[PDB]
Amino acid sequence: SHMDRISVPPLNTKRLLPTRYKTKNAIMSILRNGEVVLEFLKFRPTYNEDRINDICRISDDGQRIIIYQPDPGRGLPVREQPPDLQIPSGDCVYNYDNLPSKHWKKYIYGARFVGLVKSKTPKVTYFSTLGKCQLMETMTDFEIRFYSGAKLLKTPSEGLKVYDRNGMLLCSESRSLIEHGNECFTHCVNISNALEVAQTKDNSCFPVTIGRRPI
Amino acid sequence: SHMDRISVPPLNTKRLLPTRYKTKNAIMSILRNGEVVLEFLKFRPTYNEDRINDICRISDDGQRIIIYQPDPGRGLPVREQPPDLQIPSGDCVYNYDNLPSKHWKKYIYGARFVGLVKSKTPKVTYFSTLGKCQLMETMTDFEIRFYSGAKLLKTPSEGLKVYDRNGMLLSDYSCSESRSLIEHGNECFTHCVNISNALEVAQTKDNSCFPVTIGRRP
């Protein structure tokens, strides 16, 4: 039933570069091979330090999941990268369509970490007459760094905002920058749609950069 | 472990009106009192029809959960309204934090149900110079019915979709017309959000500020 399948769509790390992000509760990595590794931490007085409590690896297309607890009861100490993957024993290998519900929260955490990185990864970059425009891989996040210094931000929750170089939210000059922002956004979206036509499995069309900073 | 918990926060039916969804495997209701009632169905040859196998009731702040399994094995005939049955024992009354994982699928299903309702419930309606914009209770589902006939939809689940005057989905924005629809989308969405934000200030427990409609059909 529609009740036995997780809420998020299967994640995927298309065009996302290696990155290692760390909160107080988790280390999360996108690896060179596109896989997502989540190392959830638990502080262990016994060792007086964070320990890797459990690990969730997710394939670059979101369909294959491995979830286990390393050395249960104590886990592993934190290193500069996630631990290597030991050959799976089977009962720690799940897939997207049958992932049990008790593991959905971890998977959703991965989807969200991937969402974040996608929201900061430029897919189309364009030099307008007024500023450097960047459409992110999410197709919704977008910003312009104006040569003057101002900045326009478009996000899925607030819409378009514009700021001065130090970050104060500016006002008829705003009407001008905002209008230019809409225009660039649409151009970048059109560039993106246009380029999918030339895309093949062997040859990519992104990330793309058009024009250059004037002088 | 913190990651070994239910995958949705507590639901809530704030400002949702009564409603009833029928799927092949459940009947889902939001009652007048704000309660969610999920009726799980299963076809039973012995009766030659679908029977209600079990039931899950969830309070309006998502904090109370009651699980029934009425007339076990046999179930109940489906009715057009959910009946408020006897609870076998106090063991069947849970709260959100202690709900056992064997019932998370049910709860999450309820929370999804509620999200569907919220995504179709207008919270801010604005009549612009170009269309009727509706920002929904989710704060992220947004649509404009342009007076000219175009339509623009915005959801977290599908990004942006824009339909020309002829009801055709646009694949790109080449003409001055399509580019103006996308632009109005952004401006009107920013405004409805600002309206939502500004109104909260006037909100109390005695008086509401939503749903709100600004202006009118030209």
Curated annotation (Swiss-Prot), chain B:
Domain Cryptic POLO box 1 (CPB1): 4-120
Keyword Nucleus carried by entry: no
Keywords, comma-separated and alphabetical: ATP-binding, Cytoplasm, Cytoskeleton, Kinase, Nucleotide-binding, Serine/threonine-protein kinase, Transferase, Ubl conjugation
Localization per Swiss-Prot or TrEMBL: Cytoplasm, Cytoskeleton, Microtubule organizing center, Centrosome, Centriole
GO molecular-function term, one example from the UniProt record: ATP binding
All residue ranges annotated as the Cryptic POLO box 2 (CPB2) domain in the record: 121-218
Tissues and organs where the protein is expressed, per its UniProt entry: Expressed in testis (at protein level).
GO cellular component annotations of the record: centriole; cytoplasm; nucleus
Keyword ATP-binding: yes
GO terms of biological process kind: centriole replication; centrosome cycle; male meiotic nuclear division; positive regulation of protein catabolic process; regulation of centriole replication; regulation of protein stability; sperm axoneme assembly; syncytial blastoderm mitotic cell cycle
Post-translational modification: Ubiquitinated by the SCF-slmb ubiquitin ligase complex; leading to its degradation by the proteasome during interphase and regulating centriole number and ensuring the block to centriole reduplication.
Subunit structure: Homodimer. Interacts with Alms1a.
Protein family membership: Belongs to the protein kinase superfamily. Ser/Thr protein kinase family. CDC5/Polo subfamily.
Role of this protein: Serine/threonine-protein kinase that plays a central role in centriole duplication. Able to trigger procentriole formation on the surface of the mother centriole cylinder, using mother centriole as a platform, leading to the recruitment of centriole biogenesis proteins such as Sas-6. When overexpressed, it is able to induce centrosome amplification through the simultaneous generation of multiple procentrioles adjoining each parental centriole during S phase.
Protein name: Serine/threonine-protein kinase PLK4
Organism: Drosophila melanogaster
